[PDB]
RNA sequence: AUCAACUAGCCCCGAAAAUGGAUGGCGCUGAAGCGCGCGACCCACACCCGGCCAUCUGGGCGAGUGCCAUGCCCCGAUGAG
RNA sequence: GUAAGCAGAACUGGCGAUGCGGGAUGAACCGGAAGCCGGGUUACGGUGCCCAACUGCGCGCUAACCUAGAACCCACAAAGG
RNA sequence: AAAUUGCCGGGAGGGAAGCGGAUGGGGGCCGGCGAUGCGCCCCGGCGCUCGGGGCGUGGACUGUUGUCGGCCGCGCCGGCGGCCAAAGCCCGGGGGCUCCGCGCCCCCGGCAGCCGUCGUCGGCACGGCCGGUACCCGCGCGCCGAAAGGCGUGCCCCUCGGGGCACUGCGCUGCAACGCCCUGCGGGCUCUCCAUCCGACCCGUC
């Protein structure tokens, strides 16, 4: 903790991928569901509505010198009364992504 | 009052007043001038097979991008993206193309005067007095790239030859940084602790909710 | 349009004037029962008694969440009586009528649905009826006029949005908790979320 | 129940006097969202309904066995850790890869086996007995149920917990001593620094 | 905004009394209840 | 703020008929959720009592009664007729509430809880602010004392708003009445 | 302060079947049960807007700088089998 | 006809010929009918987990030492205490 | 040729496999997979094409931002009308209760602050998806202004602030800024394998 190695500033709030917008017997892979760490209510996700996020994973082959990958997306609208958001990405996430971390920056700010 | 502005703009009489048909009733008699048949080129080098279309001079005149209300010349901003993410800088003035123009100052942050998009900055409630700084010398051409030719591929032999040479930002930008940095440090020492503040970088330590955080 | 607006406020003050005067003079004033209904269908085209299917085809409600304007009279209100489980209907006011006409106004022009985006369409659909602008059309509907038949048959059934904020149970009547039948003043409350 | 969203590497849960079903639904949603839990002192879980009702329920659960091969059908566990684990398996879709990877994150123990002794044990307010039952309704402890069902290690867990409790009493008295000395140290610095430290006064308590 | 004679005297006191008198009369006929002197077996239960 | 019920008073009469061209006027004090529901319940009662149906009837006015002093607590009495699963019954219910409107909503919920009677089944015969020293019912009359005092045996712990709500709280809550 | 009757809400008795067993499962007891509510939310190929395909209707295009004219352009509705 | 997932009739609708959302599963029960896509909002049905939505805000009732009870059809229980 | 078998290389497997929709990870394969050419100029000879320099530019794909429209959702604020509007607050007056929840309950008459329901008018802030122009918008034919934009005359209104109306003509009329990469460990693929979430009973038939 003290004298640690890693990123020295976090300008992004963590979030967990939580699934897809799904009915009881359908999935709509176009939009994913995201839980932002620290947001608990429907009004507060109205602030993040717009602030883009990044799914950062890492593949097996090295391309452009790195295994790390990034898929880009943003918080479209709230999803429910408990601070869950719908996230729209450039290309739909893998189903394996649910449960993993996602970075939610503040770029399109105000 | 966007609607009231729209009505006042849309009124026929005020459309006359804006388009200034008067003082066109000045030059060309007391009647509106005629137009003619320009463009007598009569020299087409080549006849395209498909129906001919010429290039557009965009006659549309976009509104300049508006600045945030909470941004005033003299604010301390928070960078968000790029290599300077988290750096706390000073907003000097909005340059003419629509982007913010900021300074570190370069002595303390290492962020020079640089152009940053308004999207990727956050206003802070702090203000500095920069009445005494000269900025008019700054413009878009100051930053216009004039990117060189794509025949240079950066190889291993150039990787550190560029680093061990100084064929980089030319000396007048160096000189410029000195004057702005001095003329703004003199006013930064007036506010206590602000030198340390700008030296710091903004980090979102655990249990910090941005929407809860004021700025 | 100036004079139509002027008589809108004149009538609105006139109703209060009359009611206050009646209270002052000892009795009470009975408001004049509404001349106009807004009917909006709330049940789909599936599993309909054929007589009801005909009633809706005659009212011009041939798809769920369509809206029509109706004269009040014993001929038509006893027609709604026969088909209440399928419509919700009541008393439109000025805002509801005008903003239906503006934001969702289409005209049955030569059997085609022409959007009412300019004053010129009315010159073609009407103009043998002394209706020239959108505001004439709105007035001549709302204050049910001598030409209301033509200025309604000119209108195409309003193809409305699904109710924002939801909808109570469509199975029961509005009195019992549901949504069909008279909600006389509250079609106004519903239109702002159908539209 | 949406998920805590905490970023801890593991979350340790002091399951004493919580409700089996609700603690298990909260934990199940944590696991499905991907957060690794470690539920300790599982033997102390309170369950609504009398001990007699839970006894009868668990013996109905015992009669259920595959006729033609008993070893194949229901596997009737007895340890409180395993009974809770089965309960959470009830809420997790364990016939899918997501489901089995979900239960992989779940470690349930009786007592608090180290290295979970020297770890703050987070409780779930959404399931405490005090806040979830009306004081006066009969309930039972999962440990007392399992003892009466065929778990033969009740005495062992009691022995290990009495040892752990006294060993923690000693350390807590040590931290009382250290805390009073640190209180003295906080005032030592406070009366040493005056105007230099006013700024913390309106946000201190 | 600066306390001009924003809405001033609008009506004389003498008719401003009769208007309120008619209002109270209407409210009395509005909240008046039936005497319930028709239910000769439920008089005790109804209270009168 | 919002009241689920409102007490209206509704006046109506038969249509004018060229025999007896001035029909008699009927006033009623109704509870309903809104104007149209009050009117629809009004024609119910005149049809089953005065033999007047809406088609051969005429609505003269609907007005909504409000409470004199919402800021004072009042002992209310409601004599009500209801339909059980096997017949009809007559009840008296006493409440304490700042408004008759709130007391009536209290009574509908209490009837739907104690007797599984839905609102379509309840007819409110009579409402009267039965002041104290005359309340017949133990639950009301036991609150009639100055120097009243008692604890909160039952109080929820819950974040003041939803934002403070966390799944994990390191410390056991401290409850004390 | 008390007694008796009557009445109806939930619960209990009444209440017995064969592979092990089904409020859908776990579980639930200031409920995650029952009755009545209040907000908001979640959910169809339904409803509104927009893009495109097709069908159907209605149009425009020659003293032709004129067109797979069986063509191109435009408007409106619709699309299950 | 004792009754029948029984036989024969009347008005209507559905299935057959029909997907789709809900009722856990069901040809005809509830919503609803459909070109292929993006966006929004809904119907029926729900918001503890499975499972997207509240362990939301209120008030009572129930304690089941019988598998307490928990969805229109519906998958039942009575007379009586 | 397929069925079917072998060997080599790859891939994956807790009582089926196969198939549909998502991408993701592997492969394998695509340079029409993706551009370097236009205008202006001066020679140097062959007004025109090529050789040299200067010149402003310009390309697949992809990204961010801005501004206009369209549709949509969400939050905040203000004003007005209606009701007998009541109420608390400030002032007054009138009843019944008799030791009582008791310095109680009820009722009316003045007032000039905030405060329910229903209706209505408006202001603002955030965001999502689509669109980017031959017509609606918009630009030029005057000036000032980097620019948003401001500037004329005459008649009506309040007469402060300013507001409203007016004479009206020719033309032209595909919104922009800046990036990333360009034979790459690149880009993307409708092909192949595999994983994961959702769906999913085996067809023909009476
Ligand atoms: Mg919504
Ligand atoms: Mg519903
Ligand atoms: Mg039905
Ligand atoms: Mg009983
Ligand atoms: Mg057949
Ligand atoms: Mg959709
Ligand atoms: Mg969920
Ligand atoms: Mg072969
Ligand atoms: Mg095997
Ligand atoms: Mg597949
Ligand atoms: Mg792939
Ligand atoms: Mg916009």
D2 touches strand H (CB under 7 A): yes
Shortest Cα distance, chain F CAs vs residue E4, angstroms = 34
| Distance between CA atoms of residues F103 and F78, nearest Å | 9
Q: Which technique was the structure solved with, according to the deposited record? A: cryo-EM
User: Across the strands, what pairs with D97?
Assistant: none
Q: Is C170 exposed, middle or buried (0-12, 13-18, 19+ CB in 10 A)?
A: middle
CA atoms within 13 A on the CB side of E36: 15
Cβ atoms of residues B154 and B75 within 8 Å: no
- Residue entry with tokens 């009969």: D138
Going by C-alpha positions, the residue among C92, C120, C116 that lies closest to residue C105 is C116
Shortest Cα distance, chain F CAs vs residue E3, angstroms = 32
Residues 18-47 on C with a CB inside 8 Å of E are: 23-24, 26, 28
| Distance between CA atoms of residues B105 and B89, nearest Å | 7
β-bridge pairing D37-40 and D11-14: parallel
Question: Is A44 close to F161, i.e. CB distance below 8 A?
Answer: no
* Cis status of the peptide bond prior to C66, with omega within 30 of 0: no
What is the residue-wise DSSP string for chain C? -HHHHHHHHHHHHHHHHHHHHHHHHTS-PPPPPPSEEEEEE-S-SSS--HHHHHHHHHHT--STTEEEEEE-SHHHHHHHHTTGGGEEEE---HHHHHHHHHHT-EEEETTEEEE--STHHHHHHSSSSS--SHHHHHHHHHTT-TTHHHHHHSBPPEEPPP-TT----SSSBTTTTSSBEE-TTTHHHHHHHH-
Contacts of F59 in chain C (CB under 8 A): 30
Going by C-alpha positions, the residue among B209, B183, B185 that lies closest to residue B199 is B185
Distances (CA, A) of D196 to B4, B194, D191, D204, F129: 54, 17, 11, 15, 66
Cβ atoms of residues B142 and B115 within 8 Å: no
What is the residue-wise DSSP string for chain F? ---S-EEEEEEEEEPP-SSSSS--EEEEEEEESSHHHHHHHHHHHHHHHS---STTEEEEEEEEE--S-TTS-EEEEEEEEEEETTEEEEEEEEEEES-HHHHHHHHHHHHHHHS---GGGEEEEEEE---TTS---HHHHTT--TT-----S------SSGGG--S-BSS------
> Quick one: residue B191, left, alpha or beta (phi over 0 = left, psi -120 to 50 = alpha)?
beta
Helix/strand/coil for D203: helix
Protein chain C, residues 114-153, with a C-beta closer than 7 Å to any atom of nucleic acid strand I: none
The total of other beta-carbon atoms located within 10 Å of residue F29's CB is 18
* Cis status of the peptide bond prior to D115, with omega within 30 of 0: yes
| Distance between CA atoms of residues A47 and A35, nearest Å | 14
User: Across the strands, what pairs with A103?
Assistant: A14, A54
Shortest Cα distance, chain A CAs vs residue F69, angstroms = 36
D22 touches strand H (CB under 7 A): yes
Contacts of B122 in chain A (CB under 8 A): 106, 109
| Distance between CA atoms of residues C141 and C144, nearest Å | 5
* CA of B2, C1' of I68: distance in angstroms: 14
| Distance between CA atoms of residues B80 and A9, nearest Å | 11
Q: Which two tokens stand for residue F19?
A: 């025999």
DSSP tag of D197: G
Going by C-alpha positions, the residue among B147, B94, B145 that lies closest to residue B123 is B94
Cβ atoms of residues A54 and A91 within 8 Å: no
The total of other beta-carbon atoms located within 10 Å of residue D149's CB is 18
Q: Which two tokens stand for residue C34?
A: 């509404």
| Distance between CA atoms of residues F84 and F105, nearest Å | 19
Which are the contacts of C56, defined by CB distance < 8 A and separation ≥ 6? C41, C48, C62, C83, C86
Going by C-alpha positions, the residue among C153, C143, C62, C58 that lies closest to residue C97 is C143
Nucleotides of I under 7 A from a protein CB: 14-15, 21-27, 35-36, 39, 49, 58, 62-68, 71-75, 81-88, 100-103, 105-110, 116-129, 132-133, 138-143, 146-154, 163-180, 182, 184-187, 195-200
Question: Is C174 close to F36, i.e. CB distance below 8 A?
Answer: yes
Cβ atoms of residues A19 and A33 within 8 Å: yes
Contacts of E22 in chain C (CB under 8 A): 23-24, 26
Ligand positioned closest to the Cα atom of D1: 7
Distances (CA, A) of A101 to A75, C83, F92: 15, 55, 62
| Distance between CA atoms of residues F120 and C173, nearest Å | 13
- D38's enclosing H/E stretch is strand D37-40
| Distance between CA atoms of residues A109 and A52, nearest Å | 10
- A32's enclosing H/E stretch is strand A27-36
> Residues for chain D: how many in total?
205
Nearest to E36 among F9, F90, F126 (CB): F126
> Residues for chain B: how many in total?
215
Contacts of E46 in chain F (CB under 8 A): 79, 125-126
Q: Which of F11, F34, F36, F41 to mutate to test the interface with C (most CBs of C within 10 A)?
A: F36
| Distance between CA atoms of residues D137 and D19, nearest Å | 13
Phi, psi of E39 (to 5 degrees): -110, 85
Distances (CA, A) of C80 to C71, C90, D198: 11, 11, 77
Residues 7-36 on F with a CB inside 8 Å of A are: none
Q: Is B58 exposed, middle or buried (0-12, 13-18, 19+ CB in 10 A)?
A: exposed
Ligand positioned closest to the Cα atom of A91: 11
Contacts of F176 in chain D (CB under 8 A): none
- Chains near B, with 3+ CB pairs < 8 A? A
A82 touches strand H (CB under 7 A): yes
Q: How far is the CA of C126 from the centre of ligand 7 (A)?
A: 56
Q: Which two tokens stand for residue D81?
A: 């850790």
| Distance between CA atoms of residues D126 and D3, nearest Å | 12
Q: Which of A97, A99, A102 to mutate to test the interface with D (most CBs of D within 10 A)?
A: A99
* CA of F105, C1' of H59: distance in angstroms: 10
Q: Which two tokens stand for residue B186?
A: 């003199």
Render the burial of D194-204: b for 16+ CB within 10 Å, e for the rest.
Answer: eeeeeeeeeee
Distances (CA, A) of D64 to B209, D61, E27: 51, 6, 72
Helix/strand/coil for D182: helix
């Amino acid at each position: 903790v003290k004298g640690r190695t890693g990123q020295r500033v976090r300008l992004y709030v963590r979030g967990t991928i939580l699934g897809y917008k799904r009915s009881k017997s359908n999935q709509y892979e176009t939009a994913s569901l995201v839980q932002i760490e620290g947001v608990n209510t429907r009004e507060d996700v109205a602030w993040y509505g717009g602030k883009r996020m990044a799914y950062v994973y890492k593949a097996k082959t090295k391309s452009n010198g790195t295994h790390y990958r990034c898929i880009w997306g943003k918080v479209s609208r709230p999803h429910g009364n408990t601070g869950v958001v719908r996230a729209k990405f450039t290309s739909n996430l893998p189903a394996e992504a649910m449960g993993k971390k996602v970075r939610v920056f503040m770029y399109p700010s105000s | 009052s966007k609607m009231a502005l729209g009505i006042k703009r849309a009124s026929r009489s005020h459309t006359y007043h804006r388009r200034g048909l008067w003082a066109i009733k000045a030059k060309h008699g007391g009647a509106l001038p005629k137009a003619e048949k320009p463009a007598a080129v009569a020299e087409p080098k080549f006849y395209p097979a498909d129906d001919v279309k010429p290039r557009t001079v965009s006659t549309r005149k976009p509104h300049p991008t508006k600045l945030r209300s909470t941004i005033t010349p003299g604010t301390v901003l928070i960078l968000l993206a790029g290599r300077y993410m988290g750096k706390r800088v000073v907003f000097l003035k909005q340059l003419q193309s629509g982007l913010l123009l900021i300074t570190g100052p370069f002595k303390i942050n290492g962020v020079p005067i640089r152009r940053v998009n308004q999207a990727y900055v956050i206003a802070t409630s702090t203000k500095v007095d920069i009445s005494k700084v000269n900025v008019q010398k700054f413009d878009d051409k100051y930053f216009a790239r004039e990117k060189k030719t794509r025949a240079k591929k950066t190889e291993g032999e150039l990787f550190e030859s560029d680093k061990e040479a100084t064929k980089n930002l030319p000396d007048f930008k160096k000189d410029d940084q000195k004057v702005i940095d001095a003329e703004l440090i003199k006013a930064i020492d007036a506010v206590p602790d602000l030198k340390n503040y700008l030296g710091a970088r903004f980090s979102l330590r655990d249990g910090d909710k941005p929407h809860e955080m004021t700025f | 349009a100036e004079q139509y607006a002027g008589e809108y406020e004149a009538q609105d003050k006139e109703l209060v004037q009359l009611k206050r005067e009646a209270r002052m003079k000892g009795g009470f004033y009975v408001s004049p029962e509404a001349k106009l209904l807004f009917v909006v269908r709330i049940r789909g085209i599936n599993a309909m008694h054929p007589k009801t299917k005909k009633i809706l085809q005659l009212l011009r409600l041939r798809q769920i969440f369509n809206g029509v304007f109706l004269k009040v009279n014993k001929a038509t209100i006893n027609m709604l009586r026969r088909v209440e489980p399928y419509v919700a209907y009541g008393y439109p006011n000025l805002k509801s009528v005008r903003e239906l006409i503006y934001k969702r106004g289409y005209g049955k022009l030569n059997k085609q649905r022409i959007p009412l985006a300019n004053n010129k369409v009315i010159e073609e659909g009407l103009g043998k009826h002394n209706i020239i602008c959108i505001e004439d059309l709105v007035h001549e509907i709302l204050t049910v006029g001598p030409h209301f038949k033509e200025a309604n048959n000119f209108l195409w059934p309003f193809k409305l949005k699904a109710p924002l904020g939801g909808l109570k149970k469509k199975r029961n009547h509005y009195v019992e908790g549901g949504d069909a039948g008279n909600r006389e003043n509250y079609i106004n409350q519903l239109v702002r979320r159908m539209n | 129940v949406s998920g805590s969203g905490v970023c801890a590497k593991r979350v340790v849960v002091d399951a004493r006097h919580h409700m089996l079903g609700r603690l298990a639904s909260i934990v199940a949603k944590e696991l499905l969202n991907g957060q690794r839990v470690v539920v300790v002192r599982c033997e102390e879980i309170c369950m609504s309904g009398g001990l007699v009702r839970q006894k009868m329920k668990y013996l109905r659960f015992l009669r259920k066995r595959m006729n033609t091969k008993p070893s194949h059908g229901p596997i009737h566990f007895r340890a409180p850790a395993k009974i809770l684990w089965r309960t959470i398996r009830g809420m997790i879709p364990h016939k899918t890869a997501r489901g089995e990877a979900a239960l992989a994150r779940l470690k349930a123990y009786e007592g608090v086996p180290p290295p979970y002794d020297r770890t703050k044990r987070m409780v779930i307010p959404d399931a405490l007995k005090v806040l979830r039952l009306q004081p006066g309704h009969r309930y039972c402890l999962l440990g007392q149920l399992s003892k009466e069902v065929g778990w033969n290690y009740a005495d062992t867990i009691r022995e290990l917990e009495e040892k752990r409790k006294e060993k923690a009493k000693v350390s807590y008295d040590r931290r009382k001593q250290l805390a009073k000395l640190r209180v003295k140290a906080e005032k030592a610095a406070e009366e040493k620094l005056g105007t230099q430290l006013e700024i913390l006064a309106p946000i201190k308590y | 905004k600066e306390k001009i004679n924003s809405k001033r005297t609008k009506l004389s006191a003498e008719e401003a009394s009769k208007i309120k008198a008619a209002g109270k009369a209407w409210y009395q006929t509005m909240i008046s209840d039936s005497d319930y002197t028709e239910f000769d077996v439920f008089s005790k239960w109804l209270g009168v | 703020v919002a009241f689920r019920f409102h007490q209206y008073q509704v006046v109506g009469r038969a249509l004018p008929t060229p025999g007896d061209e001035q029909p008699k006027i009927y006033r009623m004090k109704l509870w309903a959720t809104n104007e149209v529901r009050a009117k629809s319940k009004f024609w119910y009662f005149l049809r089953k009592l005065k033999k007047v149906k809406k088609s051969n009837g005429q609505m003269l006015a609907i007005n909504e009664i409000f409470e004199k002093n919402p800021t004072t607590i009042k002992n209310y009495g409601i004599w009500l007729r209801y339909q059980s699963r096997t017949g009809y019954h007559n009840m008296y219910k006493e409440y304490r509430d700042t408004t008759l409107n709130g007391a009536v909503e209290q009574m509908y919920t209490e009837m739907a809880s104690r007797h599984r009677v839905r609102s379509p089944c309840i007819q409110i015969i009579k409402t009267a602010t039965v002041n104290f020293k005359l309340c017949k019912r133990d639950n009301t009359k036991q609150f009639h004392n100055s120097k009243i005092k008692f604890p909160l045996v039952y109080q929820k712990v819950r974040p003041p708003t939803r934002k403070l709500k966390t799944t994990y709280k390191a410390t056991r809550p401290n409850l004390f009445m």
